[PDB]
Amino acid sequence: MLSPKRTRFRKQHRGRMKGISYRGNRICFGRYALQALEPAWITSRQIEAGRRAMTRNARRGGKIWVRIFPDKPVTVRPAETRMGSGKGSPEYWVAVVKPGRILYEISGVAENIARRAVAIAASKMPIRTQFIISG
Amino acid sequence: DVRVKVILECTGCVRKSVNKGSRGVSRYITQKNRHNTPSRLELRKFCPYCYKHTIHGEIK
Amino acid sequence: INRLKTNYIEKMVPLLKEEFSYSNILEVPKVVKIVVNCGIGDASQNAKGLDAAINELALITGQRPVKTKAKTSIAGFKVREGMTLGIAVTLRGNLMYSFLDRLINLALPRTRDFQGVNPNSFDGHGNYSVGFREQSVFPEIKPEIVGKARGMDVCITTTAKTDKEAYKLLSLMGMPFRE
Amino acid sequence: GTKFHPGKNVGIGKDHTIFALIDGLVKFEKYGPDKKKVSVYPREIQPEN
Amino acid sequence: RREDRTARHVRIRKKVEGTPERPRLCVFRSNKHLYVQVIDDTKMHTLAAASTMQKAISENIDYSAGPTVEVAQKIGEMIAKSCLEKGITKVAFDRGGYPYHGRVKALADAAREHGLVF
RNA sequence: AUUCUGGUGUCCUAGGCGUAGAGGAACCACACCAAUCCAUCCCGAACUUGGUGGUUAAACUCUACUGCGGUGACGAUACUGUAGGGGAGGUCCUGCGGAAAAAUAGCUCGACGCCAGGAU
RNA sequence: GGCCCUCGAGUGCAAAGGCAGAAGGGAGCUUGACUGCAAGACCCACCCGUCGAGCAGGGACGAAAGUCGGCCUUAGUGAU
């Protein structure tokens, strides 16, 4: 659960997810990487669960990197309660991901195995991801 | 009863009366801290009945 | 006139021109001021021994120190001053050179276990300080009449640059070094 | 506060309110290092056809 | 020493120059050779000038270059002499970055007593 | 009429630093002393006063290079005015019109006005 | 005490906007925290609020030009 450490303010707005993610398009560390297509609000439970499942299929060697970190909070109001009377406490933290953004990077395994691994990591996530080789 | 408005009269135009152009004490009400400046204020100021620029004595 | 100051301007002016090879005489490294600091902590409470310490240093030369005050202690009081600390002289001119060389002759024989001052103890850009654990090094002090034994230091402020220039300046001045 | 600063022909008040002293058109000049001025200039001839 | 003195000039100038109709008397001072000049309202040109660098009274003056009380007293009449020749009564006397004490004050004294009341 | 040095602006980082060199005939600055004018919360460091016997070293002024700082396109792209369209999945696509920021090419080591004094 | 970025400090009290030889820090002298007003604007349903060139008198400070009718600005308040 990749939670932020004491941010400025507690609760904040929803905004929205216009535009393509331009910056997190490039690959730094890995040679293979998982990249997003549809925008979504990706919880830390979804990140961690992707990272675990991808790690399980690394096996002999090869290092994995995450490139998305949540930051934004989301509040669900006290369960079964009428409208109004302030906001609720933040339950979970989410990464606003837009189209064409890197989620996971990986290097140092055979292209056989990396592709197998990212299938599982794709299956754990809520969005239509895709595999990208470049580095 | 800690910081108080106070009654700066004049020592110039002390209370006189008769002869149409009546004297009529000028006055200024303004604030001082009672604790800070325990001795009474004694500022110089304009008084439109004196026509000068008198000493404005403090009282109560 | 002091034995340093008369010999300094006559003999000691063109001497350091040989080593460093300067253009003009004025740029040949020299002393601008001496600052005799004495930063006391407990003298905020009671400053009678501190007043005595003022008289101690003024009766060496004639020139007196200034009563130092702190940057920020603990007070709301904005219109008037904060918490006092200690004393500091600012020496210049003839009296500067007087106090400078007669410190080395009259005062330094009184300090025991004194091989000398540290040679590699400069700031970098040609300035220096020397610290003494007692302010009873001077000839005038007597250890029974003083209120409190409170040490001190002396800052030598020169127009120098390299670390070889300050050490050689002190050598020409006449200071008993270490190593 | 003084976002804009007072220029020529122009008063500046107790609240940093900037008001014109004379007739004429308003001018927002460039002050030097990253600030703004305001001066006022009357205009010579104004023709009507 | 000179570094700090331009600050002293700018502080006074930016306060002095701000209000219009400025026939200002600008005095200078130096280790050698003392100078002074009067400047336009719009700050374009200068109306009347005087100095120990100038040829008239520099040959009449005794001291080498001319920063002293005597020569300044002489200049204080000559600077007020040119102004009334031009036809300018009141001016705005400027320090120019020097504390108002000795030579500048002596200059002001002869400037006042001449007829040039500023 | 032209060029310097000293004073005053318009113009404010195409105008600022660094590096490298150069200037004392003048002007400008550092070194001499301080009864007195006057001064130091101490100190002629500074302010001030009286003198000159040194110097272009520091500052200041002037000539260079782009090392930095600064400014900075064209093209595209994001975005958006207006007229439409696709998706239930939450935003996307089109015509018509405006158009960044960033990045880079490249541009810069001031310009220009008046006055005082010197030189052609 | 020296060096180096230089305004990230401070600005009685929350924040925002401001403030360099300064609106920030120190000293000298004082009381414009003054009477009589006021062209003209801003803000608005009304009630209310806000800025004010300038003139008149009588002062303050300065050599002078000038600056001063409270506070660096926006809260510290109630009609009849």
UniProtKB/Swiss-Prot annotation, chain A:
Pfam families: Ribosomal_L16
GO cellular component: chloroplast; mitochondrial large ribosomal subunit
UniProt KW Ribosomal protein keyword: yes
Stretch forming the signal peptide: none
One GO biological process term: mitochondrial translation
Compartments where located: Plastid, Chloroplast
GO MF entry, a single one: structural constituent of ribosome
This protein's record includes keyword Ribosomal protein: yes
Primary localization: plastid
Biological role: Component of the chloroplast ribosome (chloro-ribosome), a dedicated translation machinery responsible for the synthesis of chloroplast genome-encoded proteins, including proteins of the transcription and translation machinery and components of the photosynthetic apparatus.
Name this polypeptide is given: Large ribosomal subunit protein uL16c
Organism: Spinacia oleracea
Gene this protein is translated from: rpl16
From Swiss-Prot, chain B:
GO cellular component, one term: chloroplast
Keyword check for Plastid: yes
Subcellular location: Plastid, Chloroplast
InterPro entries, A to Z: Ribosomal_bL33 (IPR001705), Ribosomal_bL33_CS (IPR018264), Ribosomal_bL33_sf (IPR038584), Ribosomal_zn-bd (IPR011332)
Name of a matching Pfam family: Ribosomal_L33
Keyword rRNA processing: no
UniProt-listed GO biological process terms: translation
Molecular function GO labels: structural constituent of ribosome
Keywords: Chloroplast, Plastid, Ribonucleoprotein, Ribosomal protein
PROSITE patterns assigned: RIBOSOMAL_L33
Complex formation: Component of the chloroplast large ribosomal subunit (LSU). Mature 70S chloroplast ribosomes of higher plants consist of a small (30S) and a large (50S) subunit. The 30S small subunit contains 1 molecule of ribosomal RNA (16S rRNA) and 24 different proteins. The 50S large subunit contains 3 rRNA molecules (23S, 5S and 4.5S rRNA) and 33 different proteins.
Family designation: Belongs to the bacterial ribosomal protein bL33 family.
NCBIfam families: PRK00504.1, PRK00595.1, rpmG_bact
Described function: Component of the chloroplast ribosome (chloro-ribosome), a dedicated translation machinery responsible for the synthesis of chloroplast genome-encoded proteins, including proteins of the transcription and translation machinery and components of the photosynthetic apparatus.
Protein name: Large ribosomal subunit protein bL33c
Organism: Spinacia oleracea (Spinach)
Gene: rpl33
From Swiss-Prot, chain D:
UniProt family annotation: Belongs to the bacterial ribosomal protein bL27 family.
Protein name in UniProt: Large ribosomal subunit protein bL27c
Subunit structure, interactors included: Component of the chloroplast large ribosomal subunit (LSU). Mature 70S chloroplast ribosomes of higher plants consist of a small (30S) and a large (50S) subunit. The 30S small subunit contains 1 molecule of ribosomal RNA (16S rRNA) and 24 different proteins. The 50S large subunit contains 3 rRNA molecules (23S, 5S and 4.5S rRNA) and 33 different proteins.
Subcellular location: Plastid, Chloroplast
Function: Component of the chloroplast ribosome (chloro-ribosome), a dedicated translation machinery responsible for the synthesis of chloroplast genome-encoded proteins, including proteins of the transcription and translation machinery and components of the photosynthetic apparatus.
Source species: Spinacia oleracea (Spinach)
Domain of life: Eukaryota
Residues spanning the membrane: none
Shown part of the complete sequence: 98 to 146 of 194
Swiss-Prot record, chain E:
Molecular function, one GO term: structural constituent of ribosome
GO cellular component: chloroplast; ribonucleoprotein complex; ribosome
Keyword annotations: Chloroplast, Plastid, Ribonucleoprotein, Ribosomal protein, RNA-binding, rRNA-binding, Transit peptide
Main subcellular location: plastid
GO BP of this protein: translation
TM regions (residue ranges): none
Subcellular compartments: Plastid, Chloroplast
Subunit structure comment from the entry: Component of the chloroplast large ribosomal subunit (LSU). Mature 70S chloroplast ribosomes of higher plants consist of a small (30S) and a large (50S) subunit. The 30S small subunit contains 1 molecule of ribosomal RNA (16S rRNA) and 24 different proteins. The 50S large subunit contains 3 rRNA molecules (23S, 5S and 4.5S rRNA) and 33 different proteins.
Note: There are two forms of L18, alpha and beta, both with a MW of 11.5 kDa. They probably differ by an unknown post-translational modification; their first 26 amino acids are identical.
Function: Component of the chloroplast ribosome (chloro-ribosome), a dedicated translation machinery responsible for the synthesis of chloroplast genome-encoded proteins, including proteins of the transcription and translation machinery and components of the photosynthetic apparatus.
Family recorded in the similarity comment: Belongs to the universal ribosomal protein uL18 family.
Record's protein name: Large ribosomal subunit protein uL18c
Organism of origin: Spinacia oleracea
Residue window of the full protein shown: 49 to 166 of 166
